[PDB]
Structure formats: C-alpha cells, structure tokens
C-alpha cells in the first residue's frame, strides 16, 4: 500500500480533491496538455522530484506530469505556503509528499532531502524547482562530497545554518558518493523563478551546473504574466482576509516596480488605495509615475502609509527605525520571497500578540503597534490562496513543456550543462491553450499579410527580442 | 460573577479571538468611537432595553458595545443566517449581553432566537427596537394582528419562511400570557430600520394606520446610498466570491442585475478586479447610468449563456430562473448581494443534486451533468462567505442607527415622532461624515464669511439642499 | 436678405451644417422630440428668446424648437462658449442670433438687450435660459421701472458695471414702461444651470418672480448626467487643446466636488493625472477620500499642483497668493460659470503675453509664470468644443419638454410664479429616448415583479426623493 | 537673410516660437542634454539629414542637434503630421526645412530628396530617420546605380510608383555616382520606429546596409513608453478634435495589442469607450484579455463597434467589405505608419464629403456613411497634436545620444555597418533625466543592498534581456 507522506491530515483530501476539481476547470493548459501528450506518454521513466508551493493550483500541475507518465515525489518551497488540503488529496492519490502549513525551517530542509530517497530504491532523474533549493541541496552535497566542505562550517544566516548541518547529516548517514550518483543520474531541472535562476547563471558561469537547466521564469506568459496579473488579484486577497479593512481612503507604499511590484501596486489601486511607489531603478520609476503613482522614500512613507507592501527581492527595505515611525496599526506585510525584505529580526524582543494565524500585533515601547502579516513572508501564501488558478495555469505548462523538452527530448545533447529558454513558438503555444476557455477569438493571417510582416502564419510572430 | 446562561452561539471560546479583532475594528471606527465619547458622559440609553436584529458582525459588535456605554439594557440576533461572525458573537456573549446568532442556523432556529428578543431578562418586554429587515418588527406586528383576531393570513404562507414565521406566530400565542403582543406593542417605544424593504414595510404601516410605534428610516440617510451600498459591496463582493471560489477575475465576464447603490458598487467591485462586467435594468435611468459607465446592459436571457460569474443586486423576486441556470455555462458562478434568497430561485434547485465544497459554497448538477457554483444558497454573498462590508463604512451606517436610538428614545419628551416614519436631518449626515475625516487624513477647507454668504450658507452648514442627490 | 444678426462670419455656415448634421445623429433624444410633437406644433405661437451657449449642440435644440413651431432669437451665455460656425448656420437659416467667439462683455449684455427686440414688432413670451441673464435683465429692469433704482449705482464688479449700464441705457432709450410689457408676455422662463436657479428661489421666496419657472438643473437626467459625464469627456479635451501637455506624470488640484468637480476629477484622473481636491461640504469631501483622491487645502495644493481646476460655484478660491506660490508654467482654469473663481482680476497688472486664442501665459515679478487659460471662464467651452451632443440632448430634450410645459400646458394656472420641476415620468421618458442608440437592453417588470417592488410596470420607477 | 525652406506660412514662426518655447519646460532630458553636451559640441561637423514629423517636439530635438553644433536640413516623415507653426519656427532659425501639413506625396519625395543637396554644397554625413523612408532612398539609388534597376518599374502602389519615379528622375538629374558619394559620406543613422528597424535588420542580414546604424525604437525609454503612453494620451485626441463625439456609451474596435495597441485600447477605455481587440498573435491577445478587453474578429467588430482604430503594422485590416457592413455614421482612423491598414483606395470611388481638414464623410450607394479621419493615416498627428511633450523628450534624448554615438563616438569602430541599440546605462539616464520634473524620488542603494543583488549602486540594474 502507501504510506509515504507527511501533511498536516490525511483527512482533508476529500476537500482537497473537491477544489482540485474545480481548479482542473480553471487550468485548460494543464488540461489540454494531458490530452495531447496523454497517449505517447513522454514522461514515462522520468522520476521528477518537485519542490514547488503545494497548492491547489501545484496539485493539478503534480497531477498533469503524472498522467504523461512521470513517477513524482512533492516538497513545498515554503514553509507557509502549502495548502493542507492539496498536500492531503496528493498523498491520498498515492504521490509521496512532504508538505505541511506552517512547518519548521528544519522540517523543511528535511523534507526536501527525502525527494531524493526514491520510494523502491535509488534517486530521481528530473527536478521541477521554485526558488532552486533543491538543486542546491545537490550541488552543495557534491561540492562537499568531493572535499571542498570549508563552505559549509560559516553559514551566513539561520536558514543557511540549517541548510548547511543537513549537508553535513547527509554526508555523515548516506553511503559514500551519494551527492555523486543524484547529479549523475538527473537528466535536468527546470526552474520557476528569478532566485534559482539567479543561482543557475552564477552556477552555470562558473563551469559547476551539474546538469542542463530551463529557465521557465523568463518564458513570456510566465514573467508577464504569473506575477503581473497574479499579484494583482492576489496581494489585496491577502490583505483582505488577515485584516478586513476598508482599502478606499487607505494610502499604501509599495517597495519595488518589477513584475510583482508592478502587480502589486495595481491590486491595492484597483482596491481603492492611493498607492505610492519606492524605486532604484530610475526606467521602473519612471513607469511608475508615469502609471499615476507617487515615487517616494520609503523614510518619506513611513510616518504616512496606511499599508506597506515589500516587492524589491532586496533586503533591509522597511527597517525598524522605519517602523517606529509608523503610524498605529499600520498594516505591514512581504510578497517578495524571502523574510529578510522587512527587519522581521529586529521585532522578535518586542511584544507580539497573535490575532490568527499569520496576523500578529507587534507593540513598540511607546505602544503604537503595527499589524504583521505572514512573519514577513510571501502575504498571498500566507494570509490567502496564493495566485487563482487561471494564470498558474500558464505558469505551469511551461512546466510541464520544460520536463518534456528535457527528459524527452534531449537525444541529440541539445541541452549541455547550461541554461536554456523555451523557444518562442512553445511560449506562444502555452498561449494559445489558454484563449478558448476566456472566449478570445484569433484573428488568422492571410499568407499576403503573414510575408508583409515577416512572419510565418503559424509564428513565431515576434522576435526573441521583443518585450511584449 | 455569577454563571451567564443566557445566549446561544457556535462557541464561546471563541471570545478572545472576536475581542481581538473588536478592539482592531474600533480604531477603524472613529465615528462610532467618537459618538461613545460625546454621549458617554450623559447616558442618553439608560433605561434603554434594546432589542437588535441586524447581522452579528464584528463590526455590529462596535455598535452593540456602543450602545451598551450609553446605557442601554440588550438582547440581540442576526438578521441572516450566514452572516454571524461566530468570534464576534460570542465576544458578544463573554462580555453577558444575551446574544442568539450562529454562522450557519437554520431558518426555523433563526425565528426561534427573533422570539428570544422579547423575553427580557429579568422581566418584561424590549421597549426600543433596532432592526435590520423589519423581522423583530414584523414580528410585533403580525402577532399583534392575529392575537386581535384577524388570523387568516397564517395559513396562508407565499413561501418556505412564511410557512416557518406563520408557525412561529401561532406557537407564541398558544405559549405566553393573552395579551402578549399588545403588551410588547404598548412598551416599545420606537424602531429604527436600515434597509429598503424594512422601510417599505414601515411606510405601509404607517399609511394604513396600523404602525404601533415611531419608526426613524435610516434607509435614506445619505449614508446608505452614498457609502454603505456604493462602496461596501465594491469592496465585499468580490471579496466573497473569492474567498468561495479563488477564481481568477481577470479575463472573466460578470454579469449584474440591478444598478441601483448596492449593483453601482457590485459592478465596480468586479470591474476593478478585472472582469468584464455587463447590467441588467429595468429603470430607464439606472440603465443609462451603467451604459455611460462602460457597463453593457443586457437582458439574463441574454447573459445567460455567457457570463462566467453572476450576481443579483435588484430587491425583485425572480431574476435567475431554473431557465437562466440550465443555460449557464458549466461551473458559472451564481451570487446574490440583495437581501432576500428569492432574487435567484434556489428552491427550484433543490431537487437537484448538491455537493458541498466548504461552508456557503456548493456544486449543484443538472441532469445534462452540466453544473453551478451557488454562494451562501442565493444569501448575501458578502456576509456568507467573506466578513460583509469593512468596518470603516459601517461605522457611519451604525452611528446612524446610534442616533436614532437616541432620538426615539431619549428625544421624543414632547411627542415630535408620532406612530409614523421619520427621517434624521441634513444636519447629521453632515456630523456623521464630519466624524470621518481625521482618520483617513482629509483635510477640509473653511469657508470665509463672505464666501460662505455668496453661496448662501452659514460656515457650520448645511450645505446643500435638502433634496440635493450628492 | 436676411440681416438680424451678429456672428463672427457666415461664411462658416457650410462648415456648422455638416457638424450639426452629425450632431442629429447623436442626439436621439431631440430628433424623437422632433418626431412626436412636429405634428402638433405645440410650440406655435412661441417667441422664444434663448440665452444659452452657442454651440453646434444648442443648434440641434434650437432647430429642434423651430420643428415645433417656435419663433426665436438667440444669444450666448458666455463670451467664449460660441461655436462660431454654428452661430453662422443658425444666421444662415434665418434666425436672428448675436453670438461671437470672444465678444466683449459690452457686446454680449447689448447681445442679451436684442433677445428682446422682437423681429415684426413685440416682445418674447418665453424664455430659455442658461445662467439666468436674460431673466434677470427682464427683473432688474422692471424692478428699476417701478421707482427701486439705487442699486444701479452699486456696481460691484466690472460685469456688474457692464450689467447696470444696459438697464440705464434700456430705461433711456426704450418706450416708458418697456419692462412691465416684458414682464407681462412672458408665459414661463425653463433654467438650465445652478446659478439660474439659486437667482431664481431667491425671486420667488421673495414675491419678486415675473413668470413661471421650471428648474431642468434638478431633472435627474440633466444633474446626474449633463456635468458628471459631460465635465469626465469635455474637462480634459479643454486642457489638452489649449496647452498639448502631457497629463500622465503630472497632479492636478480640482476646487469643489460638487457634480461638476466630481466629472472634472474624473476626466482628469482617466487621462492620467494624481487627482487631488479640496471642499468645505464633509459629506462630498468623504466622497472624494472615497475615490482615492487626496483631499488637501488650496494653500497645500498651490506649491505642488501641476494643474489647478476651479469647479465650485463660489469666489476666490485661487488667489493672488496662491498663484504667486506656484511652480513655474503651472496652469489654471475655471469650469464653474464665473471668472472671480480665480482672482483674474488681480492679475491684471502683471504682464500677460499671449500665445493664441484663449491661452495666455502671466509673468510674475520674480519672473515665474502660469498658463491661464480662456482668462478664467468655462474651460471646456473656451478651449474646446465643450461637452459632446449625445450627453447635451438629454439636457437639451428637458428644456424643449420644460418648454412645451410652460407655454402650451398651462391653461389652468398649474405653473404660477414660482420654481417647479418636471415629473420623474417625464425623466424617465428622456433616459428611455437616449436607450437604442447606444445599444442598451432594457428589461421589462412582469406584472407580478412590478407588484413586489410596489411600482407599475410603465414606471415611475423611484420616490421622489431617490437620489441615483 | 535666410531663403532656403519650403513650409506653409512663415507668419506663423512667432506661434511656433511660443510654444516651441512651452515645450522645452516640457522637454528635461532634452534641455539637460543641451545643457551638459553644449561645451563639449560632440555634433561639431556634422551634417544631419532628419526626417520625422516636423512637430512642436521635433523642434525642441532640432534646436537641441544644433545647440550641440550640428548643421541640419529637416523635412517631416508624414504629409499630414506638420504643425505649420512648427516648421514655421524652424525656418525663420535659419535652419532648412521643407515640412507643410497636407503636402502631397510627390512634394513629400521631392522634399526628401532635397536634404541630401546640402547647402553650400555636399551632401549630409548623418541621417535621423523615423520610418526609413531617408534610408531608403539613399539605399534604393545606391542599388539601381549600381546596376539593378529592375525593381524601379514594378510599382504596386501610388506612393510607390512615385518613390520609384523620384528615384529614376534623381539618377537622370543628378552626376554619375551620386548615391555612392551620399553613402560613402554617411557616418552612421539613428532610426526611431518598428518599421524603419525592420527594413534596417533586412539590410543588415542582406550584407547591403550602407552604414552603421542605431536602433533608437528598441531603447526601453522608447519602446516602453513613447507609444504606451504617447498614444494612451494622444489617441482619442485625435478623435476627440475631429469628431467631438461622445466616447462613454461607445463601443471602440482597436486593432492590434503591440505598444500601440496597448496605449489606444487603453486611450479609449480611460475615455469611457468599451473596448474589443483583435490579434494574430496569442500571447498579445491573452495580454488583451487579461486587461479586461474583449478579443474579437475584424468581422465580428464591423458591424457593432462605433470606433475603428488600426494599430498592426499590417496592411488590408479593415476592408471595404468590413466597411460596408459598419453602422451608419461609425468612425474610421489609422494610428499605424502607412495607409494601407485601411483600404483607403478602394474607397476612391465612392462620394466623399470633405467635414473639415482631415476629415471626410463616405458615402456608399445605399447611402449608410463613415467618418474617416486623416484619409487613413496617422490620426493622433493629423488630427490632433500627436504625442505631448513630455514622453517625446524621451524619444528625442535617445535620437540625441545616438547621434553622438555614431557621430563622435565611433573613433574605435565600434559600430561597423550593422544595427545597435543604445548601452542600458544610456537608457537608464534617459530616464533618469526625466524624473525631477515630476516629483520622482529615487531610492539610492546602499553598498550592502546592491551587493546583494547583484548590480552596481549606479546601475545597470537590470540584465539586458529584462523586458520591464
Ligand atoms: N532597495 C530597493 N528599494 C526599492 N526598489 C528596489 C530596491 N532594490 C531593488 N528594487 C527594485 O525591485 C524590483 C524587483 O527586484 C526591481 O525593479 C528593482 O529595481
Ligand atoms: N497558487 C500558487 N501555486 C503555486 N505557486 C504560486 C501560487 N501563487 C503564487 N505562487 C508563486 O509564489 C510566489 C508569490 O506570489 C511567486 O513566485 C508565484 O509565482
Ligand atoms: N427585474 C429586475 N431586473 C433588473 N433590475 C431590476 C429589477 N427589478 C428592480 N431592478 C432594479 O434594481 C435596482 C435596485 O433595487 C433598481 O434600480 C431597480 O430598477
Ligand atoms: N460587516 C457588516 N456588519 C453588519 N452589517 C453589514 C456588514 N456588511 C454589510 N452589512 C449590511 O448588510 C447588507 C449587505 O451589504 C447591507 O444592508 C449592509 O448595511
Ligand atoms: N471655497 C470652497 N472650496 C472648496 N469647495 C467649495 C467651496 N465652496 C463650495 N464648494 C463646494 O463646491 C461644490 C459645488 O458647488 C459643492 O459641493 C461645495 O461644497
Ligand atoms: N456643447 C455644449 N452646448 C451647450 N451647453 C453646454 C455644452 N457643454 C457644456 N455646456 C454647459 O456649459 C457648462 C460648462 O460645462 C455647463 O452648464 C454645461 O451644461
Ligand atoms: N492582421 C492583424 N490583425 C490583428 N493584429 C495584427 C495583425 N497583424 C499584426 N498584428 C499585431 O499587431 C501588433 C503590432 O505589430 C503585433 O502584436 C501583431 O501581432
Ligand atoms: N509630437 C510628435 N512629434 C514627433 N513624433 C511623434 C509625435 N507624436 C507621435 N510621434 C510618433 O508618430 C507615430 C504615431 O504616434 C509614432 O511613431 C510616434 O513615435
Ligand atoms: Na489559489
Ligand atoms: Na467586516
Ligand atoms: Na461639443
Ligand atoms: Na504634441
């Protein structure tokens, strides 16, 4: 039978089903992806380990790789983000999965160390990444495995302390060469977002990536897309259900004007918040302002913000001299990936009051207080739903297409130890899948009007470096 | 000291949760909090014996705590089913003001606790009542009735919760003392009402002579249409649907019937989410309203098969038929934000197969397997599946209905409010939006004397028209 | 050969045909008019005497009353508001207009006295008012007749000065008793504009009021509509034709959030504009906080404004102090009906140069300068085109009904000398004209949907006091 | 003094010197450039052939070139986009330029041709170009005098067959060698839009570009905002100034969703306008649909939309059967850069009634109309003022900075006879240099913060693949 998993309680998987069910509707890329590939089975002996949010949303991706074939253990990326449900419905599928709400930072590293004790024996052969630990557990266990462990005695921060002693647990118990035979054996990884590709460049450039690696962050209808449009309706979502305020007459600040940013300040304005926005990058400013927000100092908007939102992937951006002069119950939270954006740290000798999971009242010493949402982590996780199904959608066949390019098409060695984009015409395709489902009708080019604009009728119809 | 009996909640433990989240709700409350302070000092609701019937909120928590620093004695209910917050209710409890609300009761448990408004602790009647609806005042009315003689109507119910309120009725006059709705009828000494049909009722009453007490409409305080129906369900609403379904709104087709305060707000709040959203109207007006806003307006016949998200927001009876539903799209989602579960016909629906997905959200299937989403079984969407409008503008709504509990109650010494309905003056719309302003940073300009003299008005107000539509 | 007339060139009567013949196309709710009442002439027998901005829209009006039988003669309500090519159609098709683009304000009250000179001998016997002028002409000169004439040595500003010296030459030069003969003939006065119809309470609370009066202002279909949407398409138009600026990047200061302050707003904001307001009304200035604009006083606007839009109905809201605080080149206009909104009259010792027609630029001695534009009068009109026909006919289609009312529905003395509105039915049938040509559907109340909701079928469908 | 111009009304100049003079406080990036290059005259010798709207803002950008010590002849990329006044300005600085709104085609060429016979003698050694169409020619002569002149007799539409006549005439009139003697002298061209980008790239992958050029249309504070919000505010202003019509209660068809598409679909919503979209491409149409627009067919939009807006680059967009089946009284317009979006010439036979400059009414037989504006060209230019100010001068500052990167920065060869884009430190301050005169406050990273994400404190911040 099965029993490898770990989730909160097996319990909720019939409610976890019913919403996957319901999401299935909502993601006709998945769905069209299973129908085409479903018969040639592409993905059948690959072994995918994933480390990825378990969502609703994850589950139906997980679900999709399985009907093309692929035998699957699931991690979330984040100690927060899982939804119980999901996690509980994939472990009644008979998926091995370790993924619990609000599991410690040393739960977390441990379970992603158990994607790579393959259920019957060995290791897996693909990785499906969101922020690219997973691979790091791989190529720092080599790194260390092959003798260069001094790295591992000097972690920078608590969770890299945590990461490094699983290392070394896992030289101590495993049998020798095992980081070896993990790298050997993966055929790939394709990662999601900007802080594991971050690390493939640096890795790939400095001649250590241990095997071939798409970036699925930047396909076009993931980076303009995913975040754009899901921040937009997910970040107010967050807001919404840990704190119930009235947003109309409400002032926020947004820290950054990315794609999430970007997003971001859009949800809270579509809300009714008069938004401001803070910027390095003089372009993104300039867009900022340019789209009617204010640009400012976050030491301008500390004393005036009703809600601050940290979009930058930087660190030290609201700090505590930044919260101090904060007005009482100011509404503070991060949709960046990591808790360092907000000096969360430099709160934890204050007095914290929880009010429900993930909202916390945090009083200073002249006792104006600040309302935290998710401990400074990911607010649309934590506090809501994460991203609607819809535009996930979109994210994940690109997923989905990126494993089959690299467990299913790299015959010829296409795919070297570097990193690699999908082509346009696939980009296009996820696209497509999704156009029937909101009712848009494509106009076809003639051939006469085709060759007028240099293109094929069937694309691609822009050129690779074309920022839509 | 002693053991409090004397409520019916989902569970009192959840008390320090809804105290938490009361004490946040009063900080966005400056109105209700500043009325506290102004009246506190001279307890203008002691000897007050409210009877309240409105939806047990967080936010209606502020309001029944307010009522209580003024003085006043209280029994309260909700005014739904499924718009209890069950923290806010037993906070509500803890703090021993007897409360019977549960997220979640059934509709003849809901006449049951109505009832309970009108054994007051320790003896005697309600003398003051606040309603939300007109079901406690409906209740003193149509038991009045039937108790002097005239009960034909109570076998003759026009729907399931007449059937359970004409029950209710006759069980009352056979359990308590002859007399009994006469008696209550002579000691309340005014309601005040919020909501369109409540005031309807009201004015019914009132011109048929059989109104039994003063009334104050505060329905028609700009308040109600300026604020609570505009923004709080452009606010809520979306907030509902997505907390039933987590749908993306962008890319998505809605479709709104109504375009009065409560679908003015309905339909922004799911344009500025992202959908496309089309009206339906039967005012000429209201409908060329939503066409220059950039709304479609359209007939259910004609968004039938089209819109992927539907929401009633008209009052009327019948406006998503088991016609319109059969035609829907697989998995549209259907909503109503009006105040009864008659706008959309659930009871057709219920020979059909439901699954529940959570609370206040259920797939229902068609024979053709082709399915729905129904929301909170066709009630307020806003209340059933997210926290209603937010506290910011409520406070303005429920000091409103502060003032006219004073009013009837503490300012009627000289009978200037007869067994007719009354509207609160310019004046204190004016005061209740004055409240507001501080909080949310508005700074407002001071006329001079000379201009305030070349536009016609005193400095202090008012300043518009009484019948200025803002 | 016609000859009673004044435009700037009937030359440009070929020109305002063609614009007036796409006008009737917009305008659904005056070609109806035309359609049902042609056949019975309601309007024959009236001598009209129409004080209104001479647009290509009031052309439509205007011809539509003659389709009814109406005799007219026509003048503008404001020195800038003409369009001079319609001003030339009307001339062109024999009706007596005094209407220039940019007339001083001595030709335009002379322009007002003509309205009265009716053509074959006599006076008017109705009145079509926009602002009031014509009316309050016909009062002060008979109050004056009548022996009370102090009050026309107490001029109070340079219009008023204009103003007092008609009557003085009128008395002079007409017949004795002129004004009493007037007054007499004139069957009812329909007023468009707030500041008409706060003159005209002002008359009736005090037993002054001549003639009966409808107030179209208050129609529902006029106040809810005419300025809302009106000032959210015309505002903009008049700022961009007279100074090509950019809007998005840019804050604008909107005075008043009354109808015309909250379409101004509007038009500003959709074009890209941060929105800012100030009002002495809590109840409006809670709605402006409502919608996200940051509602500040005009001596914290005045440094930082961008753009300054006056939109009050009061005076001296943009004062010398104010303008000689702001940036440089800031620009400033009015779209309340006045020009002492703005302190225009204190700018007149500064050098202004021109730059074209209705668009000046004011130096200031430390050598920062504003843009004024249409020397602080209606901007819309000034500088452009004002608001577009379809929103104007259902303006335009309350006065003709307003006229029929008085002129023809009055055999019993149900109009006396006081201020009335037209029923909601007839409210609702204006609304009902505007329907098909726009593509609205309008739903039909079964007989027992009506019942439910205590309405007929047919309408009305609102109380009376229903505030839309 | 100086003769040598061709421009409607020298009278005029004075106008054009005021608003020109408007502008510059418009224009920061343009006067900052002027200011910080003027000492150092890096233009000094150089011989600037530009070609591109001869607008207010390409006066600004004129006088810039030559305040850096360029010498200049100028002429307009589009018959109907001249302000005269403009051109007016520029002519009496004593600069040539031969530019009038309305000119004909065959005026449009002979003026072309007439900014390589450099005064004095010579020819230019620069071209700025907007649309290739000063490329071209050089390149078309260059390829028929050396030996392929088949191409000039196979003409297929009227403005080609008087481009080839033009080109056959100069090689009769001019000395043996002239367009090899023009190529020979051009240092570099700097190219502003998609179009003349595209003919670049095809010459550059032929191996028959003349000379280096620079892709000014793919800078980012180009791309990303010229025509995003260029057009979101210039579009309907177009429509506004030659249609006055009412935009609220409309429904508008937009053609398109690049950055044109993008910012007049959003031009017409801002405006009240109920949008639809078409699209060939699917990630473009998702985009649409994502922002709320209804993505249709060209055949479905004929017979419902009020507003026609072609915006594809494309040709036979809207046809003279989509035409026929249009509502009575719709309007037509082009905001793409030729006329054969629209079937213009297949309209040549029905009746056109002239309204006013740049716009005609259509009649068919069945007697139902059409409003075309500026007979199919671009309307926000020939109806309106074209894009404000504000946003050309960042256009205009990356036109300035590639001019003297060909011109004064190509000592080294760096560019050789391909096309470039500007360097993102370059972009960045355009940018940059506009967010003063809007208030923008830019965030300064610390050393820690930009360490940490990988990027200098002075930026580049972003990777040159980040489409923003
Ligand atoms: N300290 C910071 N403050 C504001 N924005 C930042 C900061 N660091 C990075 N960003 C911006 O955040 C976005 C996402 O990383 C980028 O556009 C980047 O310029
Ligand atoms: N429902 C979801 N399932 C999986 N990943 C998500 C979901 N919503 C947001 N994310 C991802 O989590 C981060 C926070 O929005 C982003 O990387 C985003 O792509
Ligand atoms: N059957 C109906 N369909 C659509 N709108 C309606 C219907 N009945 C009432 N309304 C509208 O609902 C709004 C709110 O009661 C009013 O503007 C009213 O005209
Ligand atoms: N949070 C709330 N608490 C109490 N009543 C509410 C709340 N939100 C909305 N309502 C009322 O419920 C109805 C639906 O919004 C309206 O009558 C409104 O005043
Ligand atoms: N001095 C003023 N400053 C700002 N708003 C004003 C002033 N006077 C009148 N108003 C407002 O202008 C609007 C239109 O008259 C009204 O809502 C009124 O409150
Ligand atoms: N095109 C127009 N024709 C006639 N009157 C107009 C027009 N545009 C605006 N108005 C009126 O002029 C004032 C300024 O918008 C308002 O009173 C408005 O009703
Ligand atoms: N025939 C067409 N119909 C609709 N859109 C088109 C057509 N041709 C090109 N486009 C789109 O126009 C945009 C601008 O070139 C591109 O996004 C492109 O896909
Ligand atoms: N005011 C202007 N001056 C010069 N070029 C312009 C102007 N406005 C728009 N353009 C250009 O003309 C085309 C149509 O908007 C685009 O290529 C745009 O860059
Ligand atoms: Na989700
Ligand atoms: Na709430
Ligand atoms: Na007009
Ligand atoms: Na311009």
Redo the contacts between chains.
């Keep these: 039978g099965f029993t490898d998993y770990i989730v909160k309680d097996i319990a909720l998987a019939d ?1 976890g089903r ?2 996957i069910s ?1 999401a299935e ?2 993601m006709p890329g998945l769905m069209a992806t299973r129908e085409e590939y479903g018969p040639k089975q592409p993905l059948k002996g690959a072994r995918i380990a994933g480390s990825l949010h378990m969502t ?1 949303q994850t589950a139906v991706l997980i679900e999709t790789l399985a009907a093309l074939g692929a035998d699957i253990r699931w991690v979330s990326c984040n100690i927060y983000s899982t939804q119980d449900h999901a996690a509980a419905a994939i472990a009644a599928a008979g998926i091995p999965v370790f993924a619990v709400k609000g599991e410690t930072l040393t739960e977390y590293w441990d379970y992603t160390a158990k994607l790579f004790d393959w259920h019957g024996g060995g290791t897996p052969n693909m990785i499906l990444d969101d922020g690219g630990d997973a691979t790091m557990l791989v190529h720092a266990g080599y790194r260390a495995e092959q003798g260069d462990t001094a790295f591992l005695d000097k972690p920078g921060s608590e969770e890299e302390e945590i990461f490094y002693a699983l290392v070394k647990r896992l030289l101590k118990e495993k049998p020798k060469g095992w980081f070896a035979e993990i790298a050997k054996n993966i055929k790939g990884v394709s990662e999601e977002t900007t802080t594991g590709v ?1 690390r493939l460049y640096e890795m790939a450039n400095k001649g250590t990536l241990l095997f071939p690696a798409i970036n699925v962050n ?1 396909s ?2 993931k ?3 995913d975040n754009l ?1 899901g921040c ?2 997910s970040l107010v ?1 967050g807001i ?2 840990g ?9 926020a600040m947004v820290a950054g004007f990315g794609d999430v940013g970007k997003g971001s300040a859009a949800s809270l ?6 938004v401001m926005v ?21 030491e ?1 908007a500390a004393p ?1 913000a009703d809600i601050f939102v940290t979009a930058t ?4 951006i609201i700090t505590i001299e930044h919260m101090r002069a904060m007005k ?2 100011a509404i503070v939270c991060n949709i960046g990936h990591f808790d360092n954006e907000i000096q969360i740290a430099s709160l934890r000798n204050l007095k914290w ?1 929880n ?2 999971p993930q909202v916390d ?1 945090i009083e200073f010493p002249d006792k104006h207080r600040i ?1 935290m949402l998710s401990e400074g982590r990911l607010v649309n996780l934590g506090n ?2 994460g ?5 996930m959608s ?1 994210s994940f066949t690109n997923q989905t297409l990126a494993q089959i390019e690299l467990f299913a098409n790299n015959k010829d060695s296409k795919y070297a130890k570097k990193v690699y984009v999908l082509p346009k015409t696939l ?2 395709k996820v ?2 899948l ?2 029937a489902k ?9 051939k ?2 085709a060759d ?3 293109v094929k009728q069937e ?1 691609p ?2 050129s690779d ?1 074309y ?2």
């Design positions: 409610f019913k919403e319901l509707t909502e609703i971050h930047d076009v209808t980076s303009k897309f449009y937009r309706e979502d919404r259900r704190t119930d305020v009235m947003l109309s007459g409400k002032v304005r579509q809300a009714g918040c008069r803070s910027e390095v990058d003089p372009i993104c400013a300039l867009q900022a302002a340019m789209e009617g927000y204010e640009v400012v100092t976050m301008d005036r992937g930087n660190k030290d009482d119950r009051t009010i429900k009242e309302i809501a739903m991203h609607p199904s819809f535009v979109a980009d296009e696209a497509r999704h156009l909101i009712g848009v009708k494509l106009t076809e080019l003639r006469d009007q007028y604009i240099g694309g119809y822009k470096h920022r839509y």
